[PDB]
């Protein structure tokens, strides 16, 4: 039995930035009131996890990263009502408390119980459930899924279809929902419109899928890695261009291919240069540009306000605008009915013990999503 | 008779930046095909005109400024069908050609025939109709209304109700439509929402009227000139605050007054610091901020993309989003139907010859709109 007891298990701990993950024996405390302890089944490698390693995203260390995942409930704390032991669940990097101003506003989803702004690396009660070699270890985005077992706040755990293939649906926990929703919920891509998507990783390709689902007439995929172009076309891109092939700035190339600019542009990389290009490539009078990529810590863009005064709309969002707890299960339901497939996004599968090799794949540009199995 | 002949009349010519206007004798060529020559009746003094004088807005000199106006058609060029001699009309700083991509797009209004982006200071055919002291004089925003007679492209002239009091409705030509529409069309202020309006000039107060018309629960007026507070309250402001009264940055003050930030913020001044404050004061998860003010030439803002990634929408627009030729007459019809009044905005009236005194009033902060009569 494990309920009510400290669990000893393996986890990938990041002790220092710019270093490999270390697979360690860790101790996981039992869940407190309104908490859920989950046995991880599958976790996807998202660029957001990598940003902590590279120093581009600040969060307290030492830490157990991981947020795109799926697992089975091992035990629940007192007061939990939305999930029970044995349920298949997907943890959520942005919670849905259902009580704050944001949760009550139908158009927003950045719940006030999030740990994204000035990260504490704890659960919502301000404390940590992990210890390793006599040291407390921080949580990440309230989820910490690079561990055989994690404890998450109930409002950051979504119950899903019991027949779900967890090794696939874990992508719905972050990458697919974010990319797809960025097109459908945030930009609100219109039928017959033109779109440009910067970045063809798991998130960007999911945005290409969203643009196609929304009925876009043209979807121009932009990436410096041409090996991603086949998958982009498979998922809906009508044209694929590599900025490295051109002598002039990519935003000028894009405007010239689109009668002055696209109706909707998306930055799904996390760089200041591409965020600028993305904003500049949407038409000055009717374009909308959505920021999806996470930018490097405390770095700023320099923009002339005239870029907006002419009629542009510049916006950003987390999770593709989806209210997390209500949205993820519906997306899983859609997946089960075959409304969309995730196979094209999952290029590599590896045991959790080979997590470092999974990050090597990400860095090499050979993988879209590598899914780790426990 | 003047039809078909060059007209000799008075106009206010700006020969150099930072210098008073020179009331001079000028010559106005007859209208070409698809052009309209208008006898001016009333013109409002908008800060945009002043920006050219101060060097904050660049346009070719020498030039006849003026764009917020109303007059009577004196003659029309071949092919003109939408107006005829004797019609009351309002010239439009942004045209509505009805044929370009932007005009066909229901969501936009920055017609491709505009002279706003990189101004040429001419009519749409690339030439000028004004001469003074043997030299050509440039047009401004295609309208040049600081003249007893001006020639404007047909797609930049709106026919209005024949019973319109021109000394009042000229404001619908720019300031009122821009401010009001910025709230109703651009931000799409919702009933029961909270708003913050930076700047209480003719445009800003019109934005306050728009927020009220849209049903906002709270409308916080922000201005360093407390003498504008009475009119802001009269027109709908629920609270009026002066940044100079605080030790804390204004965006922080605003967020603390509104549970983390307003739903809608408007910058209606034209300064980088207030554009930044306005963006920062809207709620990070559900706020929308609209830039209305024209910023100083070639100057940039420094923004951290995280400000948008959490869920904000940052946008800008000209003319409050109204398609100019179709929209202006509807606003005049609403005015004639007594849906709204413009009296509160018109604080001073002066004959055209005293245009410099009108600009002195603007600079002093004693006037909202000064209307000049011909
Ligand atoms: N807003 C959110 O809620 C949210 C959610 C998940 C991920 N993210 C962010 O989304 C971004 C994408 O994540 P991912 O997992 O898909 O990343 P990824 O690294 O797998 O994909 C990035 C893609 O961008 C391309 N690219 C990199 N530099 C480029 C450049 N200079 N020009 C053109 N293309 C370039 C890469 O070749 C790769 O195909 C990351 O910044 C991640 O942190 C945000
Ligand atoms: N987007 C458009 O289509 C459009 C149309 C018309 C005007 N404009 C621009 O709108 C802006 C407003 O025009 P207006 O004619 O109403 O101007 P105005 O000068 O009459 O009003 C500006 C107001 O801002 C206040 N103010 C100035 N500096 C401030 C500061 N630092 N902090 C707080 N308040 C400050 C002033 O006291 C004044 O009440 C101008 O930049 C104008 O060029 C834009
Ligand atoms: O990938 C998951 N989350 C993206 C994200 C992380 C931290 C802050 C904002 C957004
Ligand atoms: O006030 C009238 N027009 C505002 C404006 C002028 C020039 C460029 C953008 C906006
Ligand atoms: Zn992620
Ligand atoms: Zn909440
Ligand atoms: Zn047009
Ligand atoms: Zn104006």
Q: Does A101 touch chain B (CB under 8 A)?
A: yes
The neighbourhood of ligand 8, an ion, using CB within 5 A, equals B 46, 48, 174
The rounded distance, in Å, linking the Cα atoms of A319 and A327 is: 10
| Interior angle at CA A308, CA A307 and CA A313, nearest 5 | 125
CB A139 within 8 A of CB A123: yes
Which residue in A70, A304, A265, A73 sits closest to A186, CA to CA? Answer: A265
The rounded distance, in Å, linking the Cα atoms of A282 and A295 is: 20
Give residues with Cβ within 8 angstroms of B276, minimum separation 6: B251, B301, B303
CA A113 to ligand 6 centroid distance, Å: 6
* Whole-number CA gyration radius for chain A: 20
**Alpha-carbon distances of B62 from A366, B15, B52, B132, B300, rounded to whole Å:** 60, 4, 11, 10, 27
**Annotated binding residue at B228?**
yes
Nearest residue of A to residue B114, measured between CA atoms: A310
The rounded distance, in Å, linking the Cα atoms of B45 and B66 is: 7
Kindly identify the ligand whose nearest atom is closest to the C-alpha of A114: 6
CB B97 within 8 A of CB B126: no
Which residue in B74, B98, B68, B103 sits closest to B87, CA to CA? Answer: B74
* Whole-number CA gyration radius for chain B: 20
Residue length of chain B: 374
CA B289 to ligand 3 centroid distance, Å: 23
Element (H, E) at A91: strand A88-91
The rounded distance, in Å, linking the Cα atoms of A94 and A115 is: 8
| Range A179-317 has CATH code 3.90.120.10 | no
Bridge-based pairing state of the strands A301-303 and A346-351: unpaired
Which residue in B215, B221, B214 sits closest to B198, CA to CA? Answer: B221
Full DSSP string of A245-300: G-SS-HHHHHHHHTTTSBSEEEE-S--HHHHHHHHHHB-TTT-EEEE-SPPPTT--
Q: Any idea of the CA torsion for A197, A203, A205, A208, to the nearest 10 degrees?
A: -50
The rounded distance, in Å, linking the Cα atoms of A309 and A296 is: 27
Taking an 8 Å cut-off on Cβ atoms, the answer to whether B101 and A298 are in contact is no
Taking an 8 Å cut-off on Cβ atoms, the answer to whether B305 and A291 are in contact is yes
| Structural fold of domain A1-178+318-374 | Quinone Oxidoreductase; Chain A, domain 1 (3.90.180)
Which residue in B69, B28, B26, B67 sits closest to B50, CA to CA? Answer: B67
**Annotated binding residue at A200?**
yes
CB B183 within 8 A of CB B195: yes
Q: Chain A partners of B317 at a C-beta cutoff of 8 Å?
A: 309-311
The rounded distance, in Å, linking the Cα atoms of B124 and B321 is: 21
Resolution of this PDB entry, in A? 1.6
Method used to determine the 3D structure: X-ray
**Alpha-carbon distances of A244 from A201, A258, A276, rounded to whole Å:** 18, 19, 17
Nearest residue of A to residue B262, measured between CA atoms: A101
Give the tokens for residue A262.
């696209």
The rounded distance, in Å, linking the Cα atoms of A56 and B240 is: 41
**Alpha-carbon distances of B336 from A65, A343, B88, B161, B166, rounded to whole Å:** 64, 62, 14, 8, 12
- Cis check: omega of the bond before A304, within 30 degrees of 0: no
Give the SS3 label for residue A330: helix
Cross-strand bridge partners of residue B73: B38
Bridge-based pairing state of the strands B239-241 and B218-222: parallel
Mutate which of A47, A57, A178, A229 for ligand 1? The one with the most ligand atoms within 8 Å of its CB, which is A47
Q: Does B107 touch chain A (CB under 8 A)?
A: yes
Bridge-based pairing state of the strands B88-91 and B68-76: antiparallel
Q: Does A299 touch chain B (CB under 8 A)?
A: yes
Full DSSP string of B16-65: STTS--EEEEEEEPPP-TTEEEEEEEEEE--HHHHHHHHTSS---SSB--
In chain A, domain spans: 1-178+318-374, 179-317
Q: Does A127 touch chain B (CB under 8 A)?
A: no
- The b-or-e profile of A27-37 (16+ CB within 10 A means b, else e) is bbbbbbebbbb
Give the tokens for residue A248.
């002039």
């Amino acid at each position: 039995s494990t309920a009510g007891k400290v669990i000893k298990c393996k986890a990938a701990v990041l002790w220092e930035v710019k270093k490999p993950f270390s697979i360690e024996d860790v101790e996981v405390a039992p869940p407190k009131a309104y908490e859920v302890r989950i046995k991880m089944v599958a976790v996807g490698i998202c660029r957001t996890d990598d940003h902590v390693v590279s120093g581009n995203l600040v969060t307290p260390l030492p830490v157990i990263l991981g947020h795109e995942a799926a697992g089975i409930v091992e035990s629940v704390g007192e007061g939990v009502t939305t999930v029970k032991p044995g349920d298949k669940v997907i943890p959520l990097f942005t919670p849905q408390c259902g009580k704050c101003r944001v949760c009550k506003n139908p158009e927003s989803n950045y719940c006030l119980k999030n740990d994204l702004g000035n990260p504490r690396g704890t659960l919502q009660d301000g404390t940590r459930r992990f210890t390793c070699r006599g040291k407390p270890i921080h949580h990440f985005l309230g989820t910490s899924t690079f561990s055989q077992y994690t404890v998450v706040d109930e409002n950051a755990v979504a119950k899903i279809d019991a027949a779900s293939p967890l090794e696939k649906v874990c992508l719905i926990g972050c990458g697919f929902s974010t990319g797809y929703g960025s097109a459908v919920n945030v930009a609100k891509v219109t039928p017959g419109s033109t779109c440009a998507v910067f970045g063809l990783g798991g998130v960007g390709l999911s945005a290409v899928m969203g643009c196609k689902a929304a009925g876009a007439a043209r979807i121009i995929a932009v990436d410096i890695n041409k090996d991603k172009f086949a998958k982009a076309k498979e998922l809906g891109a009508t044209e694929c261009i590599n900025p490295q092939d051109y002598k002039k700035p990519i935003q000028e190339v894009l405007k010239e291919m689109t009668d002055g600019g696209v109706d909707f542009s998306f930055e799904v990389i996390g760089r200041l240069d591409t965020m600028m290009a993305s904003l500049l490539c949407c038409h000055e009078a009717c374009g909308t540009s959505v920021i999806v990529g996470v930018p490097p810590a405390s770095q700023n863009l320099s923009i002339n306000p005239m870029l907006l005064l002419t009629g542009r709309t510049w916006k950003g969002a987390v999770y593709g605008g989806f209210k997390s707890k209500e949205g993820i299960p519906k997306l899983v339901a859609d997946f089960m009915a075959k409304k969309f497939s995730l196979d094209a996004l999952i290029t590599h599968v590896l045991p959790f013990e080979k997590i470092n090799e999974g990050f090597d794949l990400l860095h090499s540009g050979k993988s879209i999503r590598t899914v780790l199995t426990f």
